[PDB]
């Protein structure tokens, strides 16, 4: 199943919701991740240039897709086919961001 | 501020997350709405044709906006400038729905 992360729009995009698939994929329970920026999923061999593109896209509230190396709670690396999009109200205000890890199987 | 509702994609789209603004707007706490379809927000003067358009859009995972009459927990009517969109993974599979109540001032 596809993992989903929802964050606040502002400050440092703290996580406000993760679906059940997120916990299966990453080994983290909601209470371990809520209120944190999702960058804790990154680790030593995560590609800096990819992280920079995510940083610029989120700052601009621009949708982005990247294949990024992430790490489970237990330290095991996994490839995250990650897509991030802003949630806008009808005035164009950004209310949240939504991140999806596409189950590519 | 703008309210946000996140639901599962399948079965009867049970609510899995509401933002702080949702509780301020509707008078419902998260524990009062989690696992329920959002239709409990409707009441006697809600326009049936508006509800039917939402029903068809969600069934087909099509984005839709409607101005729908909803009811706070205390029964006060309020105009909900509602926008709903599917959350898709990169295969096109629907992972969730997101609903926004636009704060129009
Ligand atoms: C909704 C959302 C979901 C995200 N999910 C992930 C993720 O699953 N894995 C990841 O490495 N980064 C994810 N990020 C990105 C990080 O939170 C952060 O934006 C990125 O590392 C770039 O910014 P930084 O250079 O400040 O860390 C997500 C961001 C947002 C807004
Ligand atoms: C994510 C999401 C948010 C929704 N938010 C609202 C809402 O705020 N107010 C409302 O009247 N209906 C809302 N709905 C619509 C109802 O859940 C339902 O789809 C609608 O009443 C039409 O279907 P029905 O005829 O089966 O009730 C939402 C639906 C989804 C999927």
Author numbering:
A (entry chain A), B (entry chain B): 48 to 152
Quoted from the paper:
Flavin-binding fluorescent proteins (FbFPs), engineered from prokaryotic and eukaryotic light, oxygen, voltage (LOV) photoreceptors, are promising fluorescent reporter proteins. Their small size (about 10 kDa for monomeric FbFPs such as the improved LOV (iLOV) protein derived from Arabidopsis thaliana phototropin photoreceptors) and their oxygen-independent fluorescence make them ideal reporters to monitor transport and anaerobic biological processes. In contrast to GFP-like fluorescent reporter proteins, whose absorption and fluorescence maxima can be tuned by exchanging certain chromophore-constituting amino acids, the absorption and fluorescence of FbFPs and other flavoproteins depends on noncovalently bound flavins, whose structure cannot be influenced by mutation. Using spectroscopy, X-ray crystallography, and quantum mechanics molecular mechanics calculations, we provide a firm structural and functional understanding of spectral tuning in FbFPs.
To verify the transferability of the blue-shifting Q489K mutation, identified for the plant FbFP iLOV, we introduced the corresponding Q148K mutation into the recently presented thermostable CagFbFP protein from thermophilic phototrophic bacterium Chloroflexus aggregans. Much like iLOV–Q489K, CagFbFP–Q148K possesses a blue-shifted S0→S1 absorption band with a maximum at around 444 nm (≈3 nm blue-shifted relative to parental CagFbFP) and a blue-shifted fluorescence-emission maximum (≈6 nm blue shift relative to parental CagFbFP; compare the gray dashed line and solid blue line). To verify that the structural changes, which we observed for iLOV–Q489K, are indeed a consequence of the introduced Q489K mutation and are not due to the observed succinimide modification, we obtained the structure of the corresponding CagFbFP–Q148K variant. Altogether, we were able to obtain three types of CagFbFP–Q148K crystals, all using the precipitant solutions with pH of 6.5 (data and refinement statistics are summarized in Table S1). Interestingly, the protein also crystallized using another precipitant solution for which we obtained crystals in two crystal forms. In all of the obtained models, the C terminus of the protein is clearly unlatched, and the side chain of the introduced lysine is facing away from FMN as was found in iLOV–Q489K. Thus, the succinimide modification present in iLOV–Q489K does not influence the backbone and the conformation of the introduced Lys because this modification is absent in all CagFbFP–Q148K structures. Therefore, we conclude that irrespective of the buffer and post-translational modification, the C terminus of the iLOV–Q489K and CagFbFP–Q148K variants is unlatched, the LOV core domain is opened up to allow solvent ingress, and the introduced lysine occupies an extended conformation facing away from the FMN chromophore. The photophysical properties of the CagFbFP variants are relatively straightforward to interpret.
